[PDB]
């Protein structure tokens, strides 16, 4: 069945640095955007919804809205990569990626932040 994997389930990061966390999923020879959904959250708070080849436009000022982005050029290589810049103490916690691309699955990644 469709399985999402992580190269690391824990990242330890320094305050003020930049961090990229990754989930991996099965590739086709051609990235079919119509079928792909990429969902990133921290705890239950949504960070990314990449649907139909489009990022869901957020209007609410939030912690993540200007510092978080999905590295879209990595999707065709089977990498869901979330880059968060200028890491803050509040960025510590449990992240989850859910990818749907035919089947669907999810994994969790913990981030610890040092100051």
């Amino acid at each position: 069945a469709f399985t999402v994997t992580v190269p690391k389930d824990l990242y330890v990061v320094e305050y003020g640095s930049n961090m990229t966390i990754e989930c991996k999923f099965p590739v086709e020879k051609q990235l079919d955007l119509a079928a792909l959904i990429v969902y990133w959250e921290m705890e239950d708070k949504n960070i990314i919804q990449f649907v139909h080849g489009e990022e869901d436009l957020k209007v609410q000022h939030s912690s993540y809205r200007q510092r978080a982005r999905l590295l879209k050029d990595q999707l065709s290589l089977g990498n869901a990569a979330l880059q968060i810049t200028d890491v803050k103490l509040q960025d510590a916690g449990v992240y989850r990626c859910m990818i749907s691309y035919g089947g669907a699955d999810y994994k969790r990644i913990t981030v610890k932040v040092n100051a």
Epitope: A1, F2, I37, Y39, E41, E43, D44, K45, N46, Q49, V51, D56, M98, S100, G102, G103, A104, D105, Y106
Partner: nanobody, 127 residues
């Protein structure tokens, strides 16, 4: 975290009706995306209904549009599937499922693999 428990299954003749309930508990944000899935023996779980609890926005699979309805109570501790005009092909174990997905993802994700929380299932037989 989240727990889900179904009730309401049974046996009806064609044209009959059943009402399923899913008693939902745990942090509301962790179960804002509610769904009903069904599994016939020899087949995969397939989604038939979706509700985002915060907006009330619902979605029904083409196979059940106009026959089934998904809803919740005021406290949002219970989610229902009202099943009218039942047909033999509706025979299956029915499951409630929950997760945290906001819309549009909640609407668009039909694979059972996406959902982390599940009820134990309830049998619906139409014969």
């Amino acid at each position: 975290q989240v727990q889900l428990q179904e009730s309401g299954g049974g046996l009806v003749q064609p044209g009959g009706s059943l009402r399923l309930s899913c008693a939902a508990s745990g942090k509301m944000s962790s179960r804002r995306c509610m769904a009903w899935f069904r599994q016939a023996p020899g087949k995969e779980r397939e989604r038939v209904a979706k509700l985002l609890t915060t907006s009330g926005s619902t979605y029904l699979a083409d196979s059940v549009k106009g026959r089934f309805t998904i809803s919740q109570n005021n406290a949002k501790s219970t989610v229902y599937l009202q099943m009218n005009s039942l047909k033999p092909e509706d025979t299956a174990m029915y499951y409630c499922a929950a997760d945290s997905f906001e819309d549009p993802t909640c609407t668009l994700v039909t694979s059972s693999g996406a959902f982390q929380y599940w009820g134990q299932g309830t049998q619906v037989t139409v014969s």
